[PDB]
Amino acid sequence: RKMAFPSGKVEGCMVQVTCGTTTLNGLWLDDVVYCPRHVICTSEDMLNPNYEDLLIRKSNHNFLVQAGNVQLRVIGHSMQNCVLKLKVDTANPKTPKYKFVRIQPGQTFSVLACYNGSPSGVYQCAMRPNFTIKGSFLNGSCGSVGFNIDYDCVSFCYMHHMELPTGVHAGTDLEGNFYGPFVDRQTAQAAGTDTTITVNVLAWLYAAVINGDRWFLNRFTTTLNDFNLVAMKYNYEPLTQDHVDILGPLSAQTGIAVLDMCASLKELLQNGMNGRTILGSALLEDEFTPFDVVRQC
Amino acid sequence: FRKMAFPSGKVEGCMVQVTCGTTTLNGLWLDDVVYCPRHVICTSEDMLNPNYEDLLIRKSNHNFLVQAGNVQLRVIGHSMQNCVLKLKVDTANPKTPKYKFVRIQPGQTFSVLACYNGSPSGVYQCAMRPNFTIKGSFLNGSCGSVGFNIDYDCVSFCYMHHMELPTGVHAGTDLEGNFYGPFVDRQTAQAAGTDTTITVNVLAWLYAAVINGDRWFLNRFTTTLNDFNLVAMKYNYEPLTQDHVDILGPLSAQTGIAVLDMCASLKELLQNGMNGRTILGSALLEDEFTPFDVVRQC
Numbered sequence A: 001r002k003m004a005f006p007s008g009k010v011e012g013c014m015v016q017v018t019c020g021t022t023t024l025n026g027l028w029l030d031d032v033v034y035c036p037r038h039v040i041c042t043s044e045d046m047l048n049p050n051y052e053d054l055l056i057r058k059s060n061h062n063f064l065v066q067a068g069n070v071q072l073r074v075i076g077h078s079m080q081n082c083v084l085k086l087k088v089d090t091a092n093p094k095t096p097k098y099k100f101v102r103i104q105p106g107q108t109f110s111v112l113a114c115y116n117g118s119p120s121g122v123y124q125c126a127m128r129p130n131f132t133i134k135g136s137f138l139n140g141s142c143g144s145v146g147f148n149i150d151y152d153c154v155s156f157c158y159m160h161h162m163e164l165p166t167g168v169h170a171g172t173d174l175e176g177n178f179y180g181p182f183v184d185r186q187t188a189q190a191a192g193t194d195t196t197i198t199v200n201v202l203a204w205l206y207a208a209v210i211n212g213d214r215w216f217l218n219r220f221t222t223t224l225n226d227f228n229l230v231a232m233k234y235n236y237e238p239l240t241q242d243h244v245d246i247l248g249p250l251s252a253q254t255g256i257a258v259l260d261m262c263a264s265l266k267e268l269l270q271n272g273m274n275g276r277t278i279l280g281s282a283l284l285e286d287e288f289t290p291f292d293v294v295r296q297c
Numbered sequence B: 001f002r003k004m005a006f007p008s009g010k011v012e013g014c015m016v017q018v019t020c021g022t023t024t025l026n027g028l029w030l031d032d033v034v035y036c037p038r039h040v041i042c043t044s045e046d047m048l049n050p051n052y053e054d055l056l057i058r059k060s061n062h063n064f065l066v067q068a069g070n071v072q073l074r075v076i077g078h079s080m081q082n083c084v085l086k087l088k089v090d091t092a093n094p095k096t097p098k099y100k101f102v103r104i105q106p107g108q109t110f111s112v113l114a115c116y117n118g119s120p121s122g123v124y125q126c127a128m129r130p131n132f133t134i135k136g137s138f139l140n141g142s143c144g145s146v147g148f149n150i151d152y153d154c155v156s157f158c159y160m161h162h163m164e165l166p167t168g169v170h171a172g173t174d175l176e177g178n179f180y181g182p183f184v185d186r187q188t189a190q191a192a193g194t195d196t197t198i199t200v201n202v203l204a205w206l207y208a209a210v211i212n213g214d215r216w217f218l219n220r221f222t223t224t225l226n227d228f229n230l231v232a233m234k235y236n237y238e239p240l241t242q243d244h245v246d247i248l249g250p251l252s253a254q255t256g257i258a259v260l261d262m263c264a265s266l267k268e269l270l271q272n273g274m275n276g277r278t279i280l281g282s283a284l285l286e287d288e289f290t291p292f293d294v295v296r297q298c
């Protein structure tokens, strides 16, 4: 089961940011609201926005920030990469303990999808190897954030900016740097070739075993390098030794050597699933990390 | 299409732990009442075939430890309603949302906030199967975790977790303590009915496919509801109810495809199969998205 982190600590930070006829979401932490800088653009502006130029021509009072029914007065503004930072005259008493992190491709996070500053849904995503995310984001979702929670600490890793023509999504870290080769401009952008997150597929196969499901297992084995030759042929990421290490706990728990599960996955890549399904899926799933699997088994 | 859960914060603000002796589970604190599974009053050997009424007569208010985090909530009354305990406490929860208690129908989906020792671990979307089980992620200590939907700002609580079945699926009650399906809160081996496919949700999925321009499977014909139901059961599909036809109304209006015409298309898919084709990029028909879910994501 794909499980998201409880979203309450993040819900308490979501606000609405408006500039002109453009409205999206902001993240209110202490006395600063973070949001995508393209809020300052109009229709025309978005095709090729000179953001430093557009920003210098804005005043604080052109930014309407609403926390529910309350307006928050903007007393200062600055831009860090693709994120706008609006200083407000009120501190958010619901600010959690937090940090800003930049996540690695293959890592997972929860997304709190919001519209008009109001939380609407929560779901689990992975940072794809090509630095897209297979999100569910509609008009007005920009400024929705992604996060992980460790203890009481929220690690914010993603802020939402755009959708690509293939229907996947792109955004930045909370420092405003995009994941991937994308730009916050209204143009058709393609991503690099995506690949499948191999260490996560292996984790999920282990999960299917832990769940008493093992039709895909076999007696064969493989070396790491020979597995990786086949993996790359099928646009799977190569498996590193640290990935093998990371899979130990699941390996121990099932008594199945990592490289034995690699030999099972190799057979699936070459033969297909021949109708059969694994944990309900006709497709090999690659958006559970080993941690995700462990913490839920 | 993703399994998307509701934001969990309004429910997180209601979770507590309830302990009797060394047995700890979760409870739901709304206004000045805490709701939890009655089997908190059981020891190990009580769970085999508990006499709940005789177990409760021995208990007093001061035997219940209710905690929000580490802070004790004093219990000032107790009673049993079906399979839930209602513990009256001396503090009204200041985080109580607007809420309702609803009893859902099979096929309906809801979010579960999986909790341990009163602390949330994760949130996910569940569907009530036609055999009144859910495929959860519930570990020891998860009992009392709740399922819910959020409409406007109103939380509709529909599920409270009580047990696991020998096949690994899960069973529980509504917030009035009435089990979904033919299960009892005893630690005995109980079997669920053979499960079936949630027809109304498949139809919702086919409407979703049409909304996104994937409509090769629409045929020129229609059917009666009875004829469809008799065929559907031969494929281990749930028969449709009138309420099912009704909740497909909005998607039928959005697409202009009458419900019974879509039923005719599905019947053809069942009888002829997919013939190598895909719908929304899958050869499998999805049955855990409700008509409401589809609309929320389109």
Ligand SMILES: *[C@H](O)[C@H](C[C@@H]1CCNC1=O)NC(=O)[C@H](CC(C)C)NC(=O)OC1CC2(CCN(C(=O)OC(C)(C)C)CC2)C1
Binding pocket: A024, A038, A041, A046, A137, A138, A139, A140, A141, A142, A143, A161, A162, A163, A164, A165, A166, A167, A169, A183, A184, A185, A186, A187
């Ligand atoms: C901010 O809320 C918004 C979020 C977008 C809106 C729709 N889904 C989203 O994630 N972001 C923006 O509007 C971007 C602003 C720029 C200044 C960066 N622009 C875009 O995201 O580009 C448009 C979305 C787009 C529309 C058409 N098309 C499409 O229909 O795709 C399929 C897969 C549905 C056919 C591609 C995506 C271009």
